[PDB]
Design a protein around this nucleic acid. Structure first.
Lengths: 156, 156
DNA sequence: TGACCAGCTGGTC
DNA sequence: TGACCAGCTGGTC
């Protein structure tokens, strides 16, 4: 047993209270897939994760779907994408806007919206690379946070 | 923003503390790869995670390297392994022991432990397949909890 | 920065 | 309970 365990138990009833809120807003595990940071983004913007979605997909009060990515700036400078990118994956995202949220560790700093139109420069490079490489799966290429800031439009 | 956000503003400080607490134990993010859930197992078992660590692996006061898995018994009935199971991986597992934490949501009910002797039954079946499958990687072959509760030592 | 490398896991017939 | 479907990121340079 570790001395800090006494501290963990003091906070728990508050953690469980947080996890009860996420649950109420469609999220099941706050300790996975950025589960806990999303709920923040969802409550601030007002988007909605729906029952039975694949990945972090969200919808507004009108049907529009969006793709959410989240990054911790104390650690990296490029948003992650997919561990096995290829045309098929790009197609899923192609038509929908993306929402990118930026955290200083666990504290939220900004939320930037990006139009598909702006994300085209990137889908090209990837698809193009794919071919000119032997139809081999790019391993998590990254989107620069700086690019997102200059090209996106800050909504928080 | 959504009215529930206000409720989220009351619980926040209590959340940052957990994060400050996780960061004191080698956890950079409590909302990913089971950070929160992993903090728990650590303070209980008194295990330690070493920087430049490979995933979610801890050591004891004697350098014995371990592998830690987590699971929500309330929605899936088998532990995950690797998205691309293969001989390279397997040959880094059979060398070390696995701790298994069980939760009912985010509430640990137990912690069993397994020796490489116990797990052999599975690696024998996986190399077997990969070698005649056509060296085709195995995507997240699960290990049944029942198997775990019935072949290991209860640690908690 | 581009291109390298890796990690946590959940759902189903 | 096997053998398939799939998701979220990070790290050295």
């Amino acid at each position: 047993s570790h001395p800090d365990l006494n501290k963990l138990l003091e906070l728990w009833p508050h953690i469980q209270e947080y996890q009860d809120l996420a649950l109420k807003h469609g999220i099941n595990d706050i300790f996975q897939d950025n589960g806990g940071k999303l709920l923040q983004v969802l409550l601030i913007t007002g988007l909605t994760v729906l029952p039975g979605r694949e990945g972090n997909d969200a919808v507004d009060n009108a049907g529009q779907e969006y793709e959410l990515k989240s990054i911790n700036i104390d650690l990296t400078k490029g948003f992650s994408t997919h561990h096995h990118m290829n045309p098929v994956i790009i197609a899923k995202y192609r038509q929908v806007p993306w929402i990118f949220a930026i955290y200083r560790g666990i504290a939220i700093e900004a939320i930037y919206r990006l139009e598909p139109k702006d994300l085209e420069f990137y889908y090209d490079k990837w698809e193009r690379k794919w071919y000119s490489d032997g139809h081999k799966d790019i391993n998590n290429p990254k989107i620069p946070v700086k690019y997102v800031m200059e090209h996106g439009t800050k909504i928080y």
